[PDB]
Amino acid sequence: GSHSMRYFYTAMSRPGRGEPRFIAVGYVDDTQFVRFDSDAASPRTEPRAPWIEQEGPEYWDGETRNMKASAQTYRENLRIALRYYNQSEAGSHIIQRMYGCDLGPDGRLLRGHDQSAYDGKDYIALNEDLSSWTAADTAAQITQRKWEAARVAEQLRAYLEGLCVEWLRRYLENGKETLQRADPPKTHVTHHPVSDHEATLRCWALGFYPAEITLTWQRDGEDQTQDTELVETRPAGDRTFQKWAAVVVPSGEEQRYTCHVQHEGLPKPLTLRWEP
Amino acid sequence: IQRTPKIQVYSRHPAENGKSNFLNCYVSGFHPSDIEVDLLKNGERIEKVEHSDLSFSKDWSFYLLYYTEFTPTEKDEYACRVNHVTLSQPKIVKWDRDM
Amino acid sequence: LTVQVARVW
């Protein structure tokens, strides 16, 4: 299958309570593998997956230096953003960034990403061409001009096409046993009367990896999206994920309902029904 | 400007009374990131609850998993209690084996 | 492996 690497930075100001907290985490697909937290007793890039542990002292020292450098940069960026939005120094604000690379099933660079937000709203994004920018507002346009002048897009492109891909491939190899293993969902349908004339059918998917899945109910072969309650896919804590989809049906019509499950670990999509 | 947390309370493995398991409270879709989560056993705060490293979804909203080992029974009740700048008062979501 | 590129706003 296809794979991706992503880093997520969050920088949060907290006037009156010290310098902004900076936290960085790195993922391959849905597996976290590093963390850095400037609020740790001894801030260091640390392993969060077993296959990353074999990397040597130069790796960890390098990543730690890079992360502290980033922490400082993002403290600066929070001050700057205050100026860009005419905001006081009394409020707490958040900058976020997510970036990384996507590989196709052949191991080739599918596309790269580098996007940032301010207070939970789009701020600026590297376009798919890895050479131009999309600014969300006039403040981000200032940043865009600075980055065009410094040819930031060029350096980002060299990273995303080069180191990002090479190291993702390296991780994929080292974590072959888990990163390259899809676990199909374990699925079942439950039935609970709501009243004398209605019942809830709940279609469950458990123990699957990666998180991407599709659960839909059909009635007489027709999609019931509008009448389906879908919970957000949620992590189990053992790397796997869980999800359910529920529909309320007339008593005696249960057999007209079928749950359909699509997932990367399944050779073909599954159809299931309630089994009385 | 601000987004209120979605809250789900559930077990890692399907609940079987007497069998050890993990109680999870997953909070998601929220912004800003500061949030207070407690796991409750019969209304009382469980100590030494662990949680995932702060990360976020493609819409920039944050998510955190809070978890603790536990052994379910028929009598004992579990809940998650969440507070966030978007909430006037703590929100309590009760654990339901079938949810 | 993280990117070393500085992004000053």
Author numbering:
A (entry chain A): 1 to 276
B (entry chain B): 1 to 99
C (entry chain C): 1 to 9
Pull text from the paper.
The human leucocyte antigen (HLA) molecules, encoded by the major histocompatibility complex (MHC) region of the genome, are cell surface glycoproteins responsible for the presentation of both endogenous and exogenously derived peptide antigens for immune surveillance. HLA-B*57:01, HLA-B*57:03 and HLA-B*58:01 are micropolymorphic HLA allotypes of the HLA-B17 serotype. Polymorphism within these allotypes is focussed on regions of the antigen-binding cleft (cleft polymorphisms in comparison to HLA-B*57:01: Asp114Asn and Ser116Tyr in HLA-B*57:03, and Met45Thr, Ala46Glu, Val97Arg and Val103Leu in HLA-B*58:01).
HLA-B*58:01 was similarly able to accommodate Arg and Lys residues within the E pocket, although the manner in which the Arg at PΩ-2 interacted with Asp114 differed. In contrast, PΩ-2 Arg negatively impacted the stability of HLA-B*57:03 and HLA-B*58:01 complexes.
